[PDB]
């Protein structure tokens, strides 16, 4: 016996199994020494490698012939029978696993490789409905996998679901800094068209980063659409009497070109006006001014003629998601740029002069 | 022979098979001693572990090479040939299985692990149509698996299907308390858009908890939509001359913001008015008052113009699901909050002044 182990549950571990290292075989498991409360596992490694063995090492266990799918994959490694018959143990060093050996007496055998990387990077979410969440669900940023949900805990004292997820140690300091918005993505089949196609197969969690204190306690927000494409933009609040056909994902239009989208919809402080939160992209941030009137351009408007009736149908997005359109009135002194927070007043009718304005906006 | 067993049916059990413990091998099956009415099974376990063996232990049997799907899984454990050739027996302790040994002479070998957890947590449902139910169908609360249907019994004396399901021993006391609404979920493809996408693959049973006496005899209600998202809300009843385009899932609108949904539709006590049951969310509970007139806002309404016609088309939800909208008339003494049960009278026309009301509702 060269290095011992401890664990609470031993589903896979079988005596006589082979010790792996980077999916390569060195060492041997010899003894499962049982206890009533917490079982003990003993390992043999060679006398040269135990000098190479570091106190910053973690041991993770896996067992059985695993065919992994992982999209379009089936391959099984060059494997001995000792994994095929008995539950194996692999190991590797990492940087900051010294704290797991400072606490307790001996090392712990993690149930898989995922729980072996769950030191320091483990965060906790709070969701009202775990109908979209799943164990093994990846947390993605810009479509790059930076984390994974590993468990789901239901609480009936406070009726909500605590999902504890992990982050990889490169991104544990960059993310989880407070003001971080975790949001699931999901397919939508409704009056609003769908943009997410892969989420029918495998849903993930989009994330917005933030800056501040390392909180590591988060709330899962609703399924948001604006956050993924239109980011780090100029946030504009517009007040309206009605909602109308507006919604999350409704485009903001300038001469028919989509310059931004609506982030969210909320009642006002006093319940007389709804506020519609939108973001304009950085390339189009300079377009809005302090004198930039909005108007609701939602759905089809056509004029009847008595002698003869001229009609036109664009089949545009504002039928499905009724957009807000704007233009700047002409002024030879130009009003300054819009601030990070500014309240606009929506006009109910489209002002007729908007074709003939022609306000020069440079850069 | 150290511990004996009894069972009625013996599909999997083969003499010579290995005894498992937390998917780890200790002990050995030795003898299948047959009888005409109820067969007897005999087990060998080691003299140290039989002292460790507790009267609160259950034995469950499983047999054969099971490649399980479980979503995206196929993994087969590190297994001996003794399971691969012969039907094995595993065991574990639990808290309250002493009652199974109080009754009868000896322990019973359950047919699988699921029936071994079916002590005390076994409830009974009564459904009119088992077209949606299935054996092995999970019962979920907030998307957390808290139970499983294990059998289906047709009765032709009373034409209905008794489905007997189990609950895990943590949630047997928190749930099954009377006033508990079990409802299946199912995909819908109709005039109303679908919100449930996973139910095409695997349907489950949503459940609302209640408080009272431990009934453990329940009625399976119809497929409800309002219950999952809008819960613990202010229940409001509105009376209308006709149904119209109303239905379960119809949104309640305040300045076009969805504040709540319709729970169900029911004929009145006297058949002159239908009552439309709605719930308002807790965050929006304070919006309604004792003077809050409703109106039916369903489908597309447009005005014709003779010289020229102005038209607008939202393609909003209320064409698909015709919503009820409200606003509060101005009063310098404010009427109190709506009670847990209060009957409103629906107005057929949209009252024109509603934009110019501007009633200040605090908090």
């Amino acid at each position: 016996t060269t290095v011992s182990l401890s664990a609470e549950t031993l589903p896979d571990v079988q005596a006589g199994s082979v010790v792996l290292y980077r999916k390569f075989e060195v060492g041997e498991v010899i003894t499962v020494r049982p206890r009533a409360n917490a079982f003990d596992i003993d390992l043999h490694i060679k006398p040269e490698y135990r000098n190479l063995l570091t106190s910053n090492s973690v041991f993770w266990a896996e067992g059985g012939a695993k065919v992994q799918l992982n999209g379009s994959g089936l391959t099984v490694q060059a494997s001995p029978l000792s994994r095929a018959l008995k539950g194996a143990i692999s190991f590797d060093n990492l940087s900051g696993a010294s704290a797991s050996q400072r606490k307790g007496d001996k090392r712990i055998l993690y149930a898989s490789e995922t729980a072996a990387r769950a030191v320091g990077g483990q965060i906790t979410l709070h969701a009202f409905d775990a109908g979209k969440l799943a164990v093994g669900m990846p947390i993605r940023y810009l479509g790059i996998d930076i984390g994974q949900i590993q468990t789901l805990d239901l609480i009936t004292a406070r009726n909500e679901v605590q999902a504890k997820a992990v982050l990889y140690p490169e991104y544990v300091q960059t993310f989880a800094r407070g003001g971080t918005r975790f949001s699931v993505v999901t397919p939508q089949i409704s009056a609003a068209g769908v943009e997410h196609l892969d989420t029918i197969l495998q849903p993930y969690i989009n994330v917005e980063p933030g800056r501040g204190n390392p909180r590591r306690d988060f709330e899962l927000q609703e399924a948001t659409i604006t956050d993924s494409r239109y980011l780090d933009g100029l946030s504009i609040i517009v007040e309206a009497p009605e909602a109308g056909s507006l919604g999350i994902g409704t485009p903001v239009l300038f001469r028919g070109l989509e310059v931004g989208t609506v982030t969210g919809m909320t009642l006002g402080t006093l319940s007389d006006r709804v506020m519609i939160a939108m973001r304009i992209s950085k390339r189009y941030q300079h377009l809005v001014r302090n004198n930039s009137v909005f108007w609701l351009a939602s759905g089809y408007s056509l004029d009847f003629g008595l002698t003869g009736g001229v009609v036109k149908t664009g089949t545009f997005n504002q039928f499905i998601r009724g957009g807000i359109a704007f233009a700047t009135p002409p002024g030879t002194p130009l009003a300054p740029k819009a601030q990070e927070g500014k309240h606009f007043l929506l006009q109910e009718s489209e002002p007729k002069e908007w074709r003939e304005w022609g306000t020069a906006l440079p850069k």
Side-chain angles (χ1 to χ4, degrees), chain A:
Chain A
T1 298
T2 59
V3 57
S4 296
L5 284 177
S6 296
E8 293 293 327
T9 179
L10 271 69
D12 50 354
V13 177
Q14 181 65 255
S17 64
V18 64
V19 175
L20 277 72
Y21 177 77
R22 300 293 295 162
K23 295 187 288 184
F24 177 72
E25 294 83 5
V26 53
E28 184 181 2
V29 178
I30 52 170
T31 301
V32 177
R33 185 178 64 85
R35 292 181 63 86
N37 51 3
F39 299 95
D40 186 77
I41 302 169
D42 292 331
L43 271 70
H44 183 200
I45 59 174
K46 303 295 187 291
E48 293 180 354
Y49 296 95
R50 65 183 293 167
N51 293 317
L52 187 145
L53 185 63
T54 312
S55 66
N56 292 320
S57 179
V58 296
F59 294 2
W60 64 85
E62 68 270 17
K66 184 175 178 179
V67 171
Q68 59 272 14
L69 178 66
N70 293 320
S72 297
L74 58 82
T75 177
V76 288
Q77 69 172 355
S79 177
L81 295 177
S82 296
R83 184 180 177 180
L85 276 73
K86 298 178 287 294
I89 292 171
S90 177
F91 70 102
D92 194 359
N93 289 317
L94 68 92
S95 179
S98 64
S100 295
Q101 192 175 1
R102 292 184 181 94
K103 64 180 75 174
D105 291 331
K106 295 186 288 184
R107 293 178 179 88
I108 187 167
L109 177 59
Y110 295 99
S112 178
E113 196 272 332
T114 64
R117 301 292 184 183
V119 175
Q122 186 176 3
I123 68 167
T124 300
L125 283 79
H126 293 87
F128 293 103
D129 193 1
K132 275 79 69 177
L133 296 176
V135 180
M137 187 175 177
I139 297 171
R140 292 179 182 176
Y141 177 66
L142 296 175
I144 300 298
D145 195 1
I146 53 95
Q148 184 176 1
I149 295 173
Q150 66 184 359
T151 187
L152 291 171
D153 290 331
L154 180 60
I155 293 174
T156 183
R158 295 177 294 173
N159 47 2
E160 68 182 1
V161 178
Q162 288 186 357
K164 297 178 75 68
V166 303
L167 272 72
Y168 296 99
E170 292 86 4
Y171 300 102
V172 62
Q173 187 178 2
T174 297
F175 292 158
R177 290 180 68 91
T180 297
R181 293 177 64 190
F182 290 100
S183 177
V184 298
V185 295
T186 181
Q188 64 276 16
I189 298 169
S190 293
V194 65
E195 189 180 1
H196 300 287
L197 292 174
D198 54 354
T199 59
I200 302 169
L201 176 63
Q202 183 179 3
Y204 61 93
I205 294 175
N206 195 0
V207 56
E208 287 184 350
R211 292 178 181 177
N213 297 114
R215 185 176 292 172
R216 199 175 288 115
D217 277 324
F218 295 99
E219 296 286 327
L220 188 144
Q221 290 180 354
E222 68 270 15
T224 53
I225 301 170
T226 306
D227 56 353
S228 67
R229 178 65 180 86
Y230 294 91
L231 188 61
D232 199 0
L234 182 63
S235 178
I236 302 299
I237 303 299
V238 58
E239 293 179 353
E242 302 184 1
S245 180
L246 295 170
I248 297 170
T250 298
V252 182
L253 279 307
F254 181 74
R255 293 184 184 272
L257 286 178
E258 180 176 0
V259 299
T261 51
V262 169
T263 300
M265 300 186 75
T266 308
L267 287 170
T269 63
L270 192 148
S271 297
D272 199 6
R273 290 185 299 273
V274 297
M275 59 179 70
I276 292 97
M278 61 178 67
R279 287 196 295 270
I280 310 299
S281 296
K282 289 176 70 175
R283 294 179 181 177
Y284 291 154
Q285 182 178 0
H286 63 89
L287 293 177
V288 296
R289 297 293 182 182
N290 290 319
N291 49 3
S292 295
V293 292
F294 287 177
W295 61 86
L296 183 64
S298 180
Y300 296 156
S301 179
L302 58 93
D303 49 348
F304 181 74
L306 184 62
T307 302
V310 175
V311 293
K312 61 182 183 294
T313 56
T315 323
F316 41 77
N317 198 5
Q318 299 172 357
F319 188 74
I320 289 95
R321 293 177 182 175
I324 302 169
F326 63 97
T328 303
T332 50
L334 277 75
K337 290 182 180 179
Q339 295 298 110
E340 186 67 27
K342 184 173 174 65
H343 293 88
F344 289 164
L345 190 145
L346 187 144
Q347 292 180 356
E348 68 273 16
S349 178
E350 182 181 0
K352 292 176 70 176
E353 296 179 354
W354 76 282
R355 296 176 184 268
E356 293 177 353
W357 283 350
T359 302
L361 293 174
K363 73 183 290 294

PDB file of all heavy atoms in Angstrom, chain A residues 22 58-62 90 110-118 148 168:
ATOM      1  N   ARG A  22      -3.637   9.433 -17.127  1.00  0.00           N
ATOM      2  CA  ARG A  22      -3.892  10.028 -18.446  1.00  0.00           C
ATOM      3  C   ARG A  22      -4.340   8.963 -19.445  1.00  0.00           C
ATOM      4  O   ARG A  22      -3.860   8.910 -20.581  1.00  0.00           O
ATOM      5  CB  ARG A  22      -2.673  10.798 -18.969  1.00  0.00           C
ATOM      6  CG  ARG A  22      -2.223  11.947 -18.081  1.00  0.00           C
ATOM      7  CD  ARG A  22      -3.251  13.062 -18.061  1.00  0.00           C
ATOM      8  NE  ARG A  22      -3.403  13.687 -19.370  1.00  0.00           N
ATOM      9  CZ  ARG A  22      -4.448  14.428 -19.726  1.00  0.00           C
ATOM     10  NH1 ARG A  22      -5.439  14.632 -18.869  1.00  0.00           N
ATOM     11  NH2 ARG A  22      -4.505  14.958 -20.938  1.00  0.00           N
ATOM     12  N   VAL A  58      -5.356  14.724  -7.548  1.00  0.00           N
ATOM     13  CA  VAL A  58      -6.694  14.223  -7.269  1.00  0.00           C
ATOM     14  C   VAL A  58      -6.839  12.858  -7.922  1.00  0.00           C
ATOM     15  O   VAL A  58      -6.206  12.566  -8.942  1.00  0.00           O
ATOM     16  CB  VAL A  58      -7.801  15.179  -7.759  1.00  0.00           C
ATOM     17  CG1 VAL A  58      -7.731  16.480  -7.005  1.00  0.00           C
ATOM     18  CG2 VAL A  58      -7.682  15.429  -9.252  1.00  0.00           C
ATOM     19  N   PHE A  59      -7.645  12.001  -7.304  1.00  0.00           N
ATOM     20  CA  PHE A  59      -7.913  10.671  -7.836  1.00  0.00           C
ATOM     21  C   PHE A  59      -9.389  10.622  -8.207  1.00  0.00           C
ATOM     22  O   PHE A  59     -10.242  10.964  -7.385  1.00  0.00           O
ATOM     23  CB  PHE A  59      -7.616   9.543  -6.832  1.00  0.00           C
ATOM     24  CG  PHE A  59      -6.150   9.363  -6.442  1.00  0.00           C
ATOM     25  CD1 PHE A  59      -5.137  10.171  -6.912  1.00  0.00           C
ATOM     26  CD2 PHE A  59      -5.797   8.300  -5.636  1.00  0.00           C
ATOM     27  CE1 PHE A  59      -3.824   9.963  -6.549  1.00  0.00           C
ATOM     28  CE2 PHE A  59      -4.486   8.083  -5.271  1.00  0.00           C
ATOM     29  CZ  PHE A  59      -3.500   8.916  -5.732  1.00  0.00           C
ATOM     30  N   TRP A  60      -9.697  10.202  -9.430  1.00  0.00           N
ATOM     31  CA  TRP A  60     -11.088  10.037  -9.824  1.00  0.00           C
ATOM     32  C   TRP A  60     -11.310   8.638 -10.376  1.00  0.00           C
ATOM     33  O   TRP A  60     -10.446   8.075 -11.051  1.00  0.00           O
ATOM     34  CB  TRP A  60     -11.541  11.081 -10.852  1.00  0.00           C
ATOM     35  CG  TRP A  60     -10.870  11.032 -12.180  1.00  0.00           C
ATOM     36  CD1 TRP A  60     -11.206  10.241 -13.236  1.00  0.00           C
ATOM     37  CD2 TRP A  60      -9.794  11.857 -12.626  1.00  0.00           C
ATOM     38  NE1 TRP A  60     -10.382  10.495 -14.298  1.00  0.00           N
ATOM     39  CE2 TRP A  60      -9.505  11.484 -13.950  1.00  0.00           C
ATOM     40  CE3 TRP A  60      -9.032  12.862 -12.028  1.00  0.00           C
ATOM     41  CZ2 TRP A  60      -8.494  12.083 -14.689  1.00  0.00           C
ATOM     42  CZ3 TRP A  60      -8.025  13.453 -12.762  1.00  0.00           C
ATOM     43  CH2 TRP A  60      -7.766  13.063 -14.079  1.00  0.00           C
ATOM     44  N   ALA A  61     -12.490   8.094 -10.097  1.00  0.00           N
ATOM     45  CA  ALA A  61     -12.823   6.716 -10.422  1.00  0.00           C
ATOM     46  C   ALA A  61     -13.837   6.655 -11.556  1.00  0.00           C
ATOM     47  O   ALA A  61     -14.748   7.483 -11.631  1.00  0.00           O
ATOM     48  CB  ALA A  61     -13.384   5.995  -9.193  1.00  0.00           C
ATOM     49  N   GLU A  62     -13.672   5.668 -12.433  1.00  0.00           N
ATOM     50  CA  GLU A  62     -14.669   5.344 -13.442  1.00  0.00           C
ATOM     51  C   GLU A  62     -14.653   3.836 -13.662  1.00  0.00           C
ATOM     52  O   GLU A  62     -13.631   3.178 -13.458  1.00  0.00           O
ATOM     53  CB  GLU A  62     -14.424   6.102 -14.755  1.00  0.00           C
ATOM     54  CG  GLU A  62     -13.176   5.700 -15.530  1.00  0.00           C
ATOM     55  CD  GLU A  62     -11.948   6.501 -15.152  1.00  0.00           C
ATOM     56  OE1 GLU A  62     -11.955   7.153 -14.087  1.00  0.00           O
ATOM     57  OE2 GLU A  62     -10.975   6.488 -15.935  1.00  0.00           O
ATOM     58  N   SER A  90      -8.278   6.548 -12.269  1.00  0.00           N
ATOM     59  CA  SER A  90      -7.269   7.361 -12.929  1.00  0.00           C
ATOM     60  C   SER A  90      -6.901   8.535 -12.036  1.00  0.00           C
ATOM     61  O   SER A  90      -7.609   8.856 -11.080  1.00  0.00           O
ATOM     62  CB  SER A  90      -7.769   7.868 -14.283  1.00  0.00           C
ATOM     63  OG  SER A  90      -6.810   8.718 -14.887  1.00  0.00           O
ATOM     64  N   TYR A 110     -13.053  10.822  -5.840  1.00  0.00           N
ATOM     65  CA  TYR A 110     -14.254  11.400  -6.415  1.00  0.00           C
ATOM     66  C   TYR A 110     -14.952  10.380  -7.303  1.00  0.00           C
ATOM     67  O   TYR A 110     -14.329   9.463  -7.843  1.00  0.00           O
ATOM     68  CB  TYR A 110     -13.908  12.666  -7.194  1.00  0.00           C
ATOM     69  CG  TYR A 110     -13.382  13.760  -6.297  1.00  0.00           C
ATOM     70  CD1 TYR A 110     -12.019  13.994  -6.181  1.00  0.00           C
ATOM     71  CD2 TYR A 110     -14.247  14.540  -5.545  1.00  0.00           C
ATOM     72  CE1 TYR A 110     -11.533  14.987  -5.354  1.00  0.00           C
ATOM     73  CE2 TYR A 110     -13.772  15.534  -4.714  1.00  0.00           C
ATOM     74  CZ  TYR A 110     -12.415  15.753  -4.624  1.00  0.00           C
ATOM     75  OH  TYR A 110     -11.936  16.741  -3.798  1.00  0.00           O
ATOM     76  N   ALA A 111     -16.270  10.543  -7.436  1.00  0.00           N
ATOM     77  CA  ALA A 111     -17.088   9.557  -8.131  1.00  0.00           C
ATOM     78  C   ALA A 111     -16.855   9.549  -9.634  1.00  0.00           C
ATOM     79  O   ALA A 111     -17.138   8.537 -10.281  1.00  0.00           O
ATOM     80  CB  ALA A 111     -18.567   9.805  -7.840  1.00  0.00           C
ATOM     81  N   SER A 112     -16.348  10.641 -10.198  1.00  0.00           N
ATOM     82  CA  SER A 112     -15.989  10.699 -11.608  1.00  0.00           C
ATOM     83  C   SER A 112     -14.988  11.827 -11.796  1.00  0.00           C
ATOM     84  O   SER A 112     -14.555  12.465 -10.834  1.00  0.00           O
ATOM     85  CB  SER A 112     -17.213  10.907 -12.502  1.00  0.00           C
ATOM     86  OG  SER A 112     -16.821  10.993 -13.859  1.00  0.00           O
ATOM     87  N   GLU A 113     -14.627  12.071 -13.057  1.00  0.00           N
ATOM     88  CA  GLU A 113     -13.682  13.137 -13.365  1.00  0.00           C
ATOM     89  C   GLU A 113     -14.318  14.512 -13.195  1.00  0.00           C
ATOM     90  O   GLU A 113     -13.615  15.492 -12.921  1.00  0.00           O
ATOM     91  CB  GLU A 113     -13.145  12.952 -14.786  1.00  0.00           C
ATOM     92  CG  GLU A 113     -11.884  13.741 -15.122  1.00  0.00           C
ATOM     93  CD  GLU A 113     -12.166  15.133 -15.642  1.00  0.00           C
ATOM     94  OE1 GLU A 113     -13.239  15.332 -16.246  1.00  0.00           O
ATOM     95  OE2 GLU A 113     -11.316  16.025 -15.440  1.00  0.00           O
ATOM     96  N   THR A 114     -15.643  14.600 -13.344  1.00  0.00           N
ATOM     97  CA  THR A 114     -16.329  15.882 -13.220  1.00  0.00           C
ATOM     98  C   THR A 114     -16.315  16.381 -11.782  1.00  0.00           C
ATOM     99  O   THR A 114     -16.081  17.569 -11.535  1.00  0.00           O
ATOM    100  CB  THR A 114     -17.765  15.761 -13.721  1.00  0.00           C
ATOM    101  OG1 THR A 114     -18.486  14.851 -12.882  1.00  0.00           O
ATOM    102  CG2 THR A 114     -17.783  15.239 -15.150  1.00  0.00           C
ATOM    103  N   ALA A 115     -16.552  15.489 -10.820  1.00  0.00           N
ATOM    104  CA  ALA A 115     -16.503  15.882  -9.419  1.00  0.00           C
ATOM    105  C   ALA A 115     -15.080  16.104  -8.928  1.00  0.00           C
ATOM    106  O   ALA A 115     -14.891  16.749  -7.893  1.00  0.00           O
ATOM    107  CB  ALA A 115     -17.197  14.834  -8.551  1.00  0.00           C
ATOM    108  N   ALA A 116     -14.078  15.590  -9.641  1.00  0.00           N
ATOM    109  CA  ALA A 116     -12.695  15.843  -9.258  1.00  0.00           C
ATOM    110  C   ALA A 116     -12.260  17.255  -9.615  1.00  0.00           C
ATOM    111  O   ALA A 116     -11.359  17.803  -8.971  1.00  0.00           O
ATOM    112  CB  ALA A 116     -11.767  14.829  -9.920  1.00  0.00           C
ATOM    113  N   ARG A 117     -12.873  17.854 -10.628  1.00  0.00           N
ATOM    114  CA  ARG A 117     -12.636  19.249 -10.965  1.00  0.00           C
ATOM    115  C   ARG A 117     -13.549  20.199 -10.202  1.00  0.00           C
ATOM    116  O   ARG A 117     -13.509  21.408 -10.448  1.00  0.00           O
ATOM    117  CB  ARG A 117     -12.813  19.459 -12.470  1.00  0.00           C
ATOM    118  CG  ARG A 117     -11.877  18.617 -13.321  1.00  0.00           C
ATOM    119  CD  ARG A 117     -10.432  19.057 -13.162  1.00  0.00           C
ATOM    120  NE  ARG A 117      -9.540  18.318 -14.051  1.00  0.00           N
ATOM    121  CZ  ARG A 117      -8.220  18.466 -14.078  1.00  0.00           C
ATOM    122  NH1 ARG A 117      -7.631  19.329 -13.263  1.00  0.00           N
ATOM    123  NH2 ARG A 117      -7.490  17.752 -14.922  1.00  0.00           N
ATOM    124  N   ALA A 118     -14.369  19.680  -9.289  1.00  0.00           N
ATOM    125  CA  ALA A 118     -15.335  20.490  -8.546  1.00  0.00           C
ATOM    126  C   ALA A 118     -14.741  20.899  -7.198  1.00  0.00           C
ATOM    127  O   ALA A 118     -15.234  20.551  -6.123  1.00  0.00           O
ATOM    128  CB  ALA A 118     -16.640  19.727  -8.370  1.00  0.00           C
ATOM    129  N   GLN A 148     -20.924  23.197 -16.004  1.00  0.00           N
ATOM    130  CA  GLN A 148     -21.786  22.025 -16.033  1.00  0.00           C
ATOM    131  C   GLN A 148     -22.595  21.895 -14.750  1.00  0.00           C
ATOM    132  O   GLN A 148     -22.048  22.037 -13.655  1.00  0.00           O
ATOM    133  CB  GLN A 148     -20.936  20.775 -16.251  1.00  0.00           C
ATOM    134  CG  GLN A 148     -21.702  19.491 -16.389  1.00  0.00           C
ATOM    135  CD  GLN A 148     -20.790  18.330 -16.700  1.00  0.00           C
ATOM    136  OE1 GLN A 148     -19.575  18.493 -16.788  1.00  0.00           O
ATOM    137  NE2 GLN A 148     -21.368  17.149 -16.865  1.00  0.00           N
ATOM    138  N   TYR A 168     -15.135  25.588 -14.712  1.00  0.00           N
ATOM    139  CA  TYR A 168     -13.762  25.172 -14.907  1.00  0.00           C
ATOM    140  C   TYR A 168     -12.823  26.225 -14.318  1.00  0.00           C
ATOM    141  O   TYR A 168     -13.165  27.409 -14.277  1.00  0.00           O
ATOM    142  CB  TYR A 168     -13.501  24.960 -16.393  1.00  0.00           C
ATOM    143  CG  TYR A 168     -14.333  23.831 -16.941  1.00  0.00           C
ATOM    144  CD1 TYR A 168     -15.503  24.086 -17.627  1.00  0.00           C
ATOM    145  CD2 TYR A 168     -13.964  22.511 -16.744  1.00  0.00           C
ATOM    146  CE1 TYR A 168     -16.282  23.065 -18.120  1.00  0.00           C
ATOM    147  CE2 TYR A 168     -14.737  21.477 -17.236  1.00  0.00           C
ATOM    148  CZ  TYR A 168     -15.894  21.764 -17.923  1.00  0.00           C
ATOM    149  OH  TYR A 168     -16.668  20.745 -18.416  1.00  0.00           O
TER     150      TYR A 168
END
